[PDB]
Amino acid sequence: HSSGLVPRGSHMSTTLAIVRLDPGLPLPSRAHDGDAGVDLYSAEDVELAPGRRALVRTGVAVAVPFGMVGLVHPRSGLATRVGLSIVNSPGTIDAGYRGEIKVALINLDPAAPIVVHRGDRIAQLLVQRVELVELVEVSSFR
Amino acid sequence: HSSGLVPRGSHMSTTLAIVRLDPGLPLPSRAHDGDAGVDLYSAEDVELAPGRRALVRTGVAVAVPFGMVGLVHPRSGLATRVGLSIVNSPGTIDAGYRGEIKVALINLDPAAPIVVHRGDRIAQLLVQRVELVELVEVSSFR
Amino acid sequence: HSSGLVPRGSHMSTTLAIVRLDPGLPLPSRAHDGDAGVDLYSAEDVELAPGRRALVRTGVAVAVPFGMVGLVHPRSGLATRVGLSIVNSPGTIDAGYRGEIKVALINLDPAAPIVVHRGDRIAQLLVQRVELVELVEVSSFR
Ligand SMILES: O=c1ccn([C@H]2C[C@H](O)[C@@H](COP(=O)(O)NP(=O)(O)OP(=O)(O)O)O2)c(=O)[nH]1
Ligand SMILES: O=c1ccn([C@H]2C[C@H](O)[C@@H](COP(=O)(O)NP(=O)(O)OP(=O)(O)O)O2)c(=O)[nH]1
Ligand SMILES: O=c1ccn([C@H]2C[C@H](O)[C@@H](COP(=O)(O)NP(=O)(O)OP(=O)(O)O)O2)c(=O)[nH]1
Numbered sequence: 301h302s303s304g305l306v307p308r309g310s311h312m313s314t315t316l317a318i319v320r321l322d323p324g325l326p327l328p329s330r331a332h333d334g335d336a337g338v339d340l341y342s343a344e345d346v347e348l349a350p351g352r353r354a355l356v357r358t359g360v361a362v363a364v365p366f367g368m369v370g371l372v373h374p375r376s377g378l379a380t381r382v383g384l385s386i387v388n389s390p391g392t393i394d395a396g397y398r399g400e401i402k403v404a405l406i407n408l409d410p411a412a413p414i415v416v417h418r419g420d421r422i423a424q425l426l427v428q429r430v431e432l433v434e435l436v437e438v439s440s441f442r
Numbered sequence: 443h444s445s446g447l448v449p450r451g452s453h454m455s456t457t458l459a460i461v462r463l464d465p466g467l468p469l470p471s472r473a474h475d476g477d478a479g480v481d482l483y484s485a486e487d488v489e490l491a492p493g494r495r496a497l498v499r500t501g502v503a504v505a506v507p508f509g510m511v512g513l514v515h516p517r518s519g520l521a522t523r524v525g526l527s528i529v530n531s532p533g534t535i536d537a538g539y540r541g542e543i544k545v546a547l548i549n550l551d552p553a554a555p556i557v558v559h560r561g562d563r564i565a566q567l568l569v570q571r572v573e574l575v576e577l578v579e580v581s582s583f584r
Numbered sequence: 585h586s587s588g589l590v591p592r593g594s595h596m597s598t599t600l601a602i603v604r605l606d607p608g609l610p611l612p613s614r615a616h617d618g619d620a621g622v623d624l625y626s627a628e629d630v631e632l633a634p635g636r637r638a639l640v641r642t643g644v645a646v647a648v649p650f651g652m653v654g655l656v657h658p659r660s661g662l663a664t665r666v667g668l669s670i671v672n673s674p675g676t677i678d679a680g681y682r683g684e685i686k687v688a689l690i691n692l693d694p695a696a697p698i699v700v701h702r703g704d705r706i707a708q709l710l711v712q713r714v715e716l717v718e719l720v721e722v723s724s725f726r
């Protein structure tokens with residue numbers, strides 16, 4: 301069968317609407333089958349000295365479904381190789397957000413600056429269900 | 443209809459029992475409809491010099507349901523604006539925990555101290571299902 | 585009843601195949617009933633000066649089920665007491681990965697080195713479902 305047919309085991313898989321605010325970047329994609337995240341691109345060149353942080357545009361906006369959350373995670377390779385991290389990791393993308401996804405990168409290396417180029421894959425976006433809990437206040441209840 | 447009626451689409455939404463150990467703080471709340479997290483308050487004033495961390499009381503205890511986990515995430519605005527982060531992010535609140543939720547804040551700015559005041563919203567709490575996995579050890583099995 | 589019987593409330597609980605690449609370490613375990621994570625051991629001695637990071641072997645490989653993700657989270661006690669963190673937290677373990685789980689530890693204390701010994705519990709592994717989303721590109725759509 302061709303790929304337009306949804307296989308039985310994927311009947312209930314979730315769709316995510318996405319706008320490329322920067323049409324010159326590829327759509328985010330999973331690096332390998334079954335990978336949890338789609339990789340987000342940087343729309344911009346950024347140089348981070350040790351300890352500096354920047355709010356980096358990804359060129360995309362998404363519509364996370366109600367009842368779900370988008371989560372922006374660092375990539376392990378950049379984290380290990382150069383100390384690149386995300387200040388607010390895991391970044392929380394709410395269902396109602398329609399703005400551009402931005403990544404708060406930070407250089408956690410003590411001495412070597414990190415150069416990010418436009419078109420580099422700088423984070424990964426996961427989508428999960430979340431419990432939109434109803435709080436029940438009690439006076440008292442490992 | 444009035445708000446006491448659970449709408450059909452919310453019939454299965456999860457309740458979370460909460461004790462305000464500090465009754466002078468508001469209950470945690472979602473900033474907007476559909477937001478993944480409820481914002482946690484600081485019960486205390488804390489000043490963090492660059493690179494310092496503190497274990498900050500939130501004034502609340504919760505009963506995360508069995509089969510779920512509470513997750514303490516940083517807020518993006520403070521992370522970007524002043525470099526505020528959480529050392530153990532995402533903080534993992536277990537179903538059996540009945541103590542006060544505490545937030546391990548850290549100042550990741552190189553030079554500017556962060557002042558947290560009692561009543562500031564310093565983190566956000568998400569609740570998700572988790573797989574309480576049964577390990578199956580094998581000798582061998584992208 | 586003896587423990588070999590799956591209780592009714594655990595009928596659908598997920599199994600996780602695991603190989604101890606280092607058979608001298610215990611299998612990861614939950615510290616308490618209902619805890620979200622199983623604690624990962626270090627296979628190695630590592631000393632981290634302030635601001636240094638290391639890619640630490642855990643001695644295990646896992647087979648996260650398709651449709652799920654493994655998540656490597658810091659432990660709160662080490663984070664608060666000595667400033668130990670994980671550069672790429674939450675570390676993302678994909679369903680297709682069959683290599684050794686490695687932990688990117690970092691010392692976020694300003695002045696005191698952290699010593700990790702072989703056999704110390706240095707992180708915790710959670711397993712959750714993830715939405716393997718199908719992107720739907722649109723021109724336009726808190
Ligand atoms: O903490 C971690 C994170 C990942 N990993 C392994 C398993 C995971 O499936 C794999 C890739 O993780 P990332 O996608 O975060 N890394 P990166 O994107 O740099 O590499 P790749 O191009 O292979 O996806 O690395 C660890 O061992 N520990
Ligand atoms: O990494 C991130 C995190 C959040 N965001 C966007 C989407 C999310 O819905 C929105 C708000 O996230 P937070 O709740 O973490 N930020 P904060 O609480 O400071 O702002 P708000 O008062 O708007 O909730 O910011 C990003 O673009 N990148
Ligand atoms: O951010 C956090 C994380 C945890 N906690 C509490 C609730 C959680 O169930 C408990 C234990 O969390 P960890 O397992 O991350 N800590 P650690 O493994 O050091 O302690 P323990 O041996 O008790 O599990 O600490 C907080 O109050 N805030």
Ligand SMILES: [Mg+2]
Binds near residue numbers: 424
């Ligand atoms: Mg990857």
Ligand SMILES: [Mg+2]
Binds near residue numbers: 473517566
């Ligand atoms: Mg918010």
Ligand SMILES: [Mg+2]
Binds near residue numbers: 615659708
């Ligand atoms: Mg623990």
